[PDB]
Design a protein around this nucleic acid. Sequence first.
DNA 1: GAGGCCGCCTGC
DNA 2: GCAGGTGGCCTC
Length: 842
Amino acid sequence: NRISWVGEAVKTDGKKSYYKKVCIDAETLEVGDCVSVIPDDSSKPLYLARVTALWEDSSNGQMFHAHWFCAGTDTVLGATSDPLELFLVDECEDMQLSYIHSKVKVIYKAPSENWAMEGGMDPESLLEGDDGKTYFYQLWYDQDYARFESPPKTQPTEDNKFKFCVSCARLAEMRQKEIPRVLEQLEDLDSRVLYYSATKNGILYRVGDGVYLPPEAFTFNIKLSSPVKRPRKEPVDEDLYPEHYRKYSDYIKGSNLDAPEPYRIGRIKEIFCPKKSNGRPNETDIKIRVNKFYRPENTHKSTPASYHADINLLYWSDEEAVVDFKAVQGRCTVEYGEDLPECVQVYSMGGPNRFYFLEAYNAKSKSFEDPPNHARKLPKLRTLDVFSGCGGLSEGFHQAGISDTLWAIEMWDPAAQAFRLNNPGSTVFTEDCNILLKLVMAGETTNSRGQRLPQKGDVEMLCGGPPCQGFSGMNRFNSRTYSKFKNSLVVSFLSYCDYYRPRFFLLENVRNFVSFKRSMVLKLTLRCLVRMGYQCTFGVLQAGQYGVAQTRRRAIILAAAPGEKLPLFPEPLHVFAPRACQLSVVVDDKKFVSNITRLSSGPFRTITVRDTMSDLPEVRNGASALEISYNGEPQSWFQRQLRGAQYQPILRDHICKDMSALVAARMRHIPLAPGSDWRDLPNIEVRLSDGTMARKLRYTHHDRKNGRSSSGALRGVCSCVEAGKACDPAARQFNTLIPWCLPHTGNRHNHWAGLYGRLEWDGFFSTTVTNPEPMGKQGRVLHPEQHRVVSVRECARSQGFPDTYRLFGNILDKHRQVGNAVPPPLAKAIGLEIKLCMLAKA
DNA sequence: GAGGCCGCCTGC
DNA sequence: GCAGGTGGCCTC
Ligand SMILES: CCc1c(C#N)c(S[C@H](C(N)=O)c2ccccc2)nc(N2CCCN(CCO)CC2)c1C#N
Ligand SMILES: Nc1ncnc2c1ncn2[C@@H]1O[C@H](CSCC[C@H](N)C(=O)O)[C@@H](O)[C@H]1O
Ligand SMILES: [Zn+2]
Ligand SMILES: [Zn+2]
């Protein structure tokens, strides 16, 4: 007695009769109108949707199609969202008309044609500002990846326009994109139909193309004896090594024993579908036959064959396998090197997923035969880099070909000088970024040096990593902290974005940026960008997956102006230890991931400490010669890349801190075996290089939790070892080889694992910090063999810096420059994603 | 300026 | 209980 149709039906598709207008009590609804629905739980707020179709079902009565909006508080923004902002989402369903509560007005707030000149909002307007009091949307939202994007431009046909749901259309396109399909048929064999090409996840595969496959897809025919398993830890003299018992965990940080294998690689020989006795092919079960390629490490030459080889070198093999097309992880190029027109280096650097071979491998004879014969630019963005440091981020972007950094802002003079030495075309402001922005906003044209300040329209890309000081805690945010946030460098960096309105924006930070203050810093940062009208997303990347022998997880925020394509995060290139690759983020009990799909493998093997620095000459503790001979050619692929094509007669900055006599003696007594650290130190007297004697540590107290040695000796060094008893300021010992403070507080610091710890050749670096110190928190900084801390050059190599990359200042200045930097290989991978967006703009 | 010293929290 | 993560504040 309320719902009655207006007019007659438009179409009668079976048991549905469609209409264009319906009357509900005193209101009339038409296709395109927006309505509210009460949730089943009356406490929850109203649902909101657009009506895309109206019909009568001959069994279920009056129906409509609801394309739901998403409330801002249901996105990652949460309670920081504008109360009246909605977001488009790909969610819709059929619903009885009786569930409609009321008609509502929803406005599309489009960015203006002058959007890039509308910046200059107060930071209060950025963080807390709202709009006029009516529902509105401006962005589309991806709930799984936390991506805000410009609304899709999907258009209907002249047939479905009367019931066109954009969500239904995009979901149908996504299902079409995912499902594997055969395209062009080649020959009809008795049992199967052969195809020339097939498609999957938007990629075209043809006979002769290379394919990535999971390591589980096939085995190699090579027969091998079982490798010798890791030996059981032998007992030790508890009196001579009193702290060795603290290594009961049997876990080695920086170890590569549990890194996965990289992809199998094959060349498609056949694409085929089984044919029923009917004769039609079964096109839901597509199969491929491939020839297996061997990586050097897959031959009877084990892992050591990978040491010198190019990371994209393969061997042909005549072994074949059949796998499901569904198992293919991606398409790659595998070419015969001698038949390539260019040199292998120009080929290898010209594009992603490029491999080559020269020889073939015979598993049965364990020999290397020769393969059978049946195998055969846009203008750069003007970039402002804020908090530029010595320029690791700018270097990677320049390597990706997208960026000319014309302006850099860096308050610390040594890093600014380093940036200048590497960027002679750039204007480098050695200035507080807060001061510079105030000058520009006041209408100044030059800073106090006479340097021309960038103006609106000059800056097309903005990038930087702003440090966090006062809000790095994980506790709640209060009046003091939030005031400290409103005046923080993060907000200053966002103010640069609001003023200049670049095409692309990148904010990089430590991983914990995503969780600081219960993730409020992240949430407020995303809210600012959305308020400005930017598309944006966030994620966590592991630098080791992009080509360095270093675990370094970093938080990344990417934003793109309206009119641009929002970039994707780059797919991992190198496999890396899975414990170091925890990239997901929880925001208000919701788990967010990035678009990255390579979760378990990748095209290239992991980069190791050996790859990084096996070619550097031996130097001593305190080495200070700034210019020395390399004494030989680069040995690994990684070293060949970082040394460059041009011959380098001189190796620079292979210098080390001059550790004191005691610390030097400790380093000399750290064993070379992998996993060695302070817990392996002998409890002996040692005469030091300056005449000092290093004293023996003696156990003066009882640790019931830790127990007693094999021969009954105590294991405590302080009265604080008792539950309650305070620190006795006389049990502290000095000039001890085993550092007193480590057994003193080791019970609540995981036994200070890694301090005075050696790198291992097969492993990776711990995070490269600004000042390598064996008794710091990241203490695993000893050379694998030499009795010293890693050099400046070795730290720069762990960050993927080219050896030509200039640093400036004393040795602590240079360590700080290197330790603060974004690894160029990570920044290059990000830049190539931005490059795809530049080329795809239309 | 150096070296020693060493809390609090998250995610399992 | 384990592993990682955040460097900085005395004291010389
Ligand atoms: C694991 C090493 C470490 C580290 C490490 N790494 C840190 S980090 C530091 C901090 N104050 O907690 C920090 C936290 C957030 C933002 C910046 C710095 N603190 C530690 N404390 C122990 C007591 C000393 N007390 C002296 C103040 O300097 C600092 C706290 C310790 C330790 N043992
Ligand atoms: N107010 C401020 N204005 C400008 N630079 C600042 C600043 N406060 C700190 N800095 C600088 O900001 C930098 C943060 S580290 C950034 C490293 C850089 N992304 C790279 O890839 O090399 C440091 O070099 C520090 O000196
Ligand atoms: Zn729909
Ligand atoms: Zn004590």
